[PDB]
Amino acid sequence: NSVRDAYIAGPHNCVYECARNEYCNDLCTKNGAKSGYCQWVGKYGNGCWCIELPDNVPIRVPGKCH
Numbered sequence: 774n775s776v777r778d779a780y781i782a783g784p785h786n787c788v789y790e791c792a793r794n795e796y797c798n799d800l801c802t803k804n805g806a807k808s809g810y811c812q813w814v815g816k817y818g819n820g821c822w823c824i825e826l827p828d829n830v831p832i833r834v835p836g837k838c839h
Contacts (some may be wrong), residue, residue, distance in 0.1 A: 778831035779835040780817055781809070787838035788820030797821035804830045 778815050781801060790793045791797050791811035801809025801823035809823040828838060 775828055777828065777832065778824050779808065779810070779822065779826060780820045781806070781823045782804070782828055782831040785839045786831070786834060786836050788817050789802045789831045790819050791821050797823070825838075 781804060783789055789797070789800060794810045797809040797811045799809075800821055801807075804823070805825075805827035806823040807825040809821055811819075812822040813819055815822065820833065823832075
């Protein structure tokens with residue numbers, strides 16, 4: 774695919790923790806996503822979740838945040 778809903782990831786395979794939904798919406802959309810929100814409960818715990826994040830931007834995948 775070219776887009777996917779998931780935890781956006783930063784260097785290196787680390788989710789972006791969050792305190793507000795807007796923080797995530799901003800982070801997600803400035804990276805090409807349709808929108809985003811803060812996930813306080815999810816597959817990887819607290820972290821920003823993006824809707825339709827372009828695939829040239831990293832998402833959290835199995836492994837450790839390093």
